[PDB]
């Protein structure tokens, strides 16, 4: 699709069999979802943003369906204010910025 | 132009006459620049993100040229590793997400 930016670019995703809402975020290196369990192994990681650093769980090789488009990659789980889809998965679905 | 997301989408902007590097950020409601020495009136604001909140100075009606495309609007000034062009100015340059 083509998404304008008058509102936050929130979309529905599928992860771990569940539906969630998430923000398509060109300013994020990584994909960060609120606290939940995902299948498999994870290891601790720290990531930063405005406000500083937080601790997250790093899950690798997680399938995520983003507005109908498939990705498989790293998902970080922790206390983010909004679920965000970062560049690690935006690249997989072929997302670009255009003007 | 078209900006892919293999790396952070850093572009040249012009603000207060000066060329700087900033991230085109669809996950940002606001534009956040570290330029602590603008003239002009400002008011305090708090903005949040992945680590919590920070204090910033809100400047209104500031011209910001982004890759040759002119914009004018609110710019928040505060500590940040990365200057951020948010949706308040991305909409003015007709930016969209596409996949």
């Amino acid at each position: 699709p083509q998404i304008t930016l008058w509102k936050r670019p929130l979309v529905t995703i599928r992860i771990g069999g569940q539906l969630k809402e998430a923000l398509l975020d060109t300013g994020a290196d990584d994909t960060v979802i609120e606290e939940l369990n995902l299948p498999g192994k994870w290891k601790p990681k720290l990531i930063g943003g405005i406000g500083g650093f937080i601790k997250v769980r790093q899950y690798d090789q997680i399938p995520v369906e983003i507005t109908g488009h498939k990705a498989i990659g790293t998902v970080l789980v922790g206390p983010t204010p909004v679920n965000i889809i970062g560049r690690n998965l935006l690249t997989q679905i072929g997302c670009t910025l255009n003007f | 132009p078209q900006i892919t997301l293999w790396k952070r989408p850093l572009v040249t902007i012009r603000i207060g006459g000066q060329l700087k590097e900033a991230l085109l950020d669809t996950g940002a409601d606001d534009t956040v620049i570290e330029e602590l020495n603008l003239p002009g009136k400002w008011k305090p604001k708090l903005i949040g993100g992945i680590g919590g909140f920070i204090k910033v100075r809100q400047y209104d009606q500031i011209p910001v040229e982004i890759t040759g495309h002119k914009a004018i609007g609110t710019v928040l000034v505060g500590p940040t590793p990365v200057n951020i062009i948010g949706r308040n100015l991305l909409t003015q340059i007709g930016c969209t997400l596409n996949f």
């Binding site: 975020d25 060109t26 300013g27 994020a28 290196d29 990584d30 960060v32 990681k45 990531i47 930063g48 943003g49 405005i50 970080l76 983010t80 204010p81 909004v82 965000i84 970062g86 | 952070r8 991230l23 950020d25 669809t26 996950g27 940002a28 409601d29 606001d30 956040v32 903005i47 949040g48 993100g49 992945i50 590793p81 990365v82 951020i84 948010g86």
Partner: peptide, 6 residues
């Protein structure tokens, strides 16, 4: 890892 503003 840097991750972006609300």
């Amino acid at each position: 890892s840097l991750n972006x503003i609300x």
